[PDB]
Amino acid sequence: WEIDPKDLTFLKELGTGQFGVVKYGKWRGQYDVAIKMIKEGSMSEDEFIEEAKVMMNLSHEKLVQLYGVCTKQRPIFIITEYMANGCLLNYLREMRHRFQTQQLLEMCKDVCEAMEYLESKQFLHRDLAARNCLVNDQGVVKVSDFGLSRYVLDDEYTSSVGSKFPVRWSPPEVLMYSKFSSKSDIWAFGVLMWEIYSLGKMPYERFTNSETAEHIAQGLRLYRPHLASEKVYTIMYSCWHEKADERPTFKILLSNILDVMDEES
Ligand SMILES: COc1cc(C(=O)Nc2cc(C(F)(F)F)ccn2)ccc1-c1nc([C@@H]2CC[C@H]3CCC(=O)N3C2)n2ccnc(N)c12
Numbered sequence: 177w178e179i180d181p182k183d184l185t186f187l188k189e190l191g192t193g194q195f196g197v198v199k200y201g202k203w204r205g206q207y208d209v210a211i212k213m214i215k216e217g218s219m220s221e222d223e224f225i226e227e228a229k230v231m232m233n234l235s236h237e238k239l240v241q242l243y244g245v246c247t248k249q250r251p252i253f254i255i256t257e258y259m260a261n262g263c264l265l266n267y268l269r270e271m272r273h274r275f276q277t278q279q280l281l282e283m284c285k286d287v288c289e290a291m292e293y294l295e296s297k298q299f300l301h302r303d304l305a306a307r308n309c310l311v312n313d314q315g316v317v318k319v320s321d322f323g324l325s326r327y328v329l330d331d332e333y334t335s336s337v338g339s340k341f342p343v344r345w346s347p348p349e350v351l352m353y354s355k356f357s358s359k360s361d362i363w364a365f366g367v368l369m370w371e372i373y374s375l376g377k378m379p380y381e382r383f384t385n386s387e388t389a390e391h392i393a394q395g396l397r398l399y400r401p402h403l404a405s406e407k408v409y410t411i412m413y414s415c416w417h418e419k420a421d422e423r424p425t426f427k428i429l430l431s432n433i434l435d436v437m438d439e440e441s
């Protein structure tokens with residue numbers, strides 16, 4: 177799955193993403209691609225390169241497509257599908273889009289289809305959130321960075337007490353016992369639906385991570401975003417059951433989202 181770095185033409189700087197600078201470019205001059213230059217010393221390179229090869233086999237219309245890697249040089253390059261509208265979090269925050277609620281539900285649906293596919297391959301995302309989803313030129317949302325938190329060397333991102341750990345997207349059993357499962361991705365998906373319907377607000381926006389972890393242990397939850405109907409709110413709320421085995425699967429969530437789309441749309 178090695179891409180010859182000479183087949184790449186760099187056209188525009190997209191900014192600093194998670195763990196490296198990204199550029200827009202062409203592969204063989206004709207095909208649009210995004211090129212991420214992995215920050216040196218930020219990943220467990222041998223483990224990361226071993227997993228990157230297995231992930232080229234994961235393919236779904238709602239997963240950002242991995243095209244190949246350039247590892248015969250440093251920094252390492254990762255070549256993927258170009259997502260012209262950038263990260264979902266910044267896309268939600270641009271008030272000029274004047275999103276209809278049908279568009280917000282379609283974004284949830286896109287992510288849910290990607291997660292149902294990863295769940296079918298017994299593959300955990302481990303850091304699902306709007307900052308990790310990307311948006312293409314047609315407004316289609318796709319999931320990225322699935323499983324990458326495992327190769328991050330900086331301890332501030334890795335452990336529950338860390339300053340960069342996704343406390344606001346974590347269920348009680350993750351915060352208390354480091355119990356990761358498909359049900360911790362389900363909880364994070366409910367939080368992501370909340371981010372979409374809140375147009376990119378920070379979950380628990382008036383709390384610190386420490387206060388959020390206490391609110392959750394007491395059984396308290398995020399409350400209904402103004403743009404979410406009662407039926408949409410029931411779906412995101414079902415992801416936050418205190419008991420992990422009572423939370424739905426991504427297949428069940430997909431069926432519920434499609435039912436609401438047919439009813440409302
Ligand atoms: C090449 O570009 C990317 C690659 C990956 C990536 O490598 N993902 C990945 C890789 C693997 C593995 F194979 F390496 F293991 C497994 C799973 N996922 C993830 C995201 C991008 C990526 N990052 C950005 C922007 C960076 C600046 C910020 C700031 C503002 C904005 O919109 N941003 C988004 N993009 C923009 C457009 N297209 C992209 N594909 C992309």
Ligand SMILES: CN(C)CCCC(=O)N1CCC[C@H]1c1nc(-c2ccc(C(=O)Nc3nccs3)cc2)c2c(N)nccn12
Nearest residue numbers: 177178179203207208209232233234235236241242243244
């Ligand atoms: C027009 N056409 C002929 C040219 C096609 C355009 C083309 O070749 N492109 C577009 C830009 C980068 C470059 C590129 N694409 C890929 C790729 C694409 C799709 C699938 C897939 O869909 N896999 C699936 N597996 C299972 C189900 S679907 C698997 C691999 C790869 C690759 N593996 N290494 C190197 C370069 N690569």
